[PDB]
Amino acid sequence: RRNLMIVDGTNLGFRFPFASSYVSTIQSLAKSYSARTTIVLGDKGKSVFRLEHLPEYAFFEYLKDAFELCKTTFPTFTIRGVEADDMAAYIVKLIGHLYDHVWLISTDGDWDTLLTDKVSRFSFTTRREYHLRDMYEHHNVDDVEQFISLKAIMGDLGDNIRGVEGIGAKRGYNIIREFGNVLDIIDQLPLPGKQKYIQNLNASEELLFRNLILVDLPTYCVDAIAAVGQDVLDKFTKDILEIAE
To answer: Which of 156, 76, 170 is nearest to 113 (CA)?
Structure first.
C-alpha cells in the first residue's frame, strides 16, 4: 500500500528449476512489507566504476529464467557493468521520498550503508531485520557515516580491498569517534599516537581515499551508473521515475 521494496536479485538467487518459487517469494515479501512498488535488481558483468579504481576488485541459467519470469511481474533491472548495490543506492535517493518506508531484500551487509530511519533491510540467511537503530548490534558502529568510514579504514579482503594494518572495528570506531569521518581524519593526518596502527594510518592517506570511493555507496552511486555511459544513467533515471509515477 505505501512502501517501496528493492530486491537484491542475484543475492536472492543464492538462497535457492526455481523461477516460480523465486517470483512467488518476492510477491510474498511485497505483501508482508506492504510494497506498492517492487523493483528487482540483478548483477550483470563486473563493476566498471570499482574496477577503474581497483583493478583487482573482488543454477545460473535457472537464475536467468528466474529473472525472465520476474520481468513479467515486477520492474526488473540489470545494467551490465553496474552492481545491484549502486542501482539500489540510486533508487533510494531518487524516489525514496515517495514512500513511507523502503525495504531492501538482501543478505549483503554492504547494503546497510543505505540505512536510515525509513530504510531497512531483511536477510533470508539470518531472518533478521536491519534498522538504523540497531547499527551497533550489527556493525559495531553507531551510524551509517561511521559504518562507511570503518569499512574504508578496515577494508574488505574478500573484495581485495586492503585496509590499514592493526585497525579493527574497535580501534577504528574509537579513531572515528575522536577524529570524525574518513575525510576529517585525512585532513588531520598525522594523528597523535605512538602505536603502530596510528603510524600505519598516517601512511594510508591515499588508501583511505580510494577505499572511501569503493565503499561509500550513497555518495558514488550516480557516478557508478554513469561509468558505463550518461545515456544509460538517463534511461535508468527515466525508468525509475516512470515506475514511481
So the answer is: 156
How far does Cα 182 stand from its chain's mean position? 18
What are the structural domain ranges in the chain?
2-134+216-241, 136-215
CATH 1.10.150.20 assigned to domain 136-215? The reply is: yes
CA distances 140 to 121, 148, 169, 213, Å, are 17, 12, 7, 21
Residues contacting 62, CB < 8 A, separation 6+: 16, 17, 18, 19
78 vs 40: CA distance, rounded Å: 9
Domain 2-134+216-241 has CATH 3.30.750.200: no
- What determination technique applies here? X-ray
Point out which residues pair with 105 in neighbouring strands: 7, 122
Residue with cell 558505463: 228
Residue 141, C-alpha cell as written in the block: 558502529
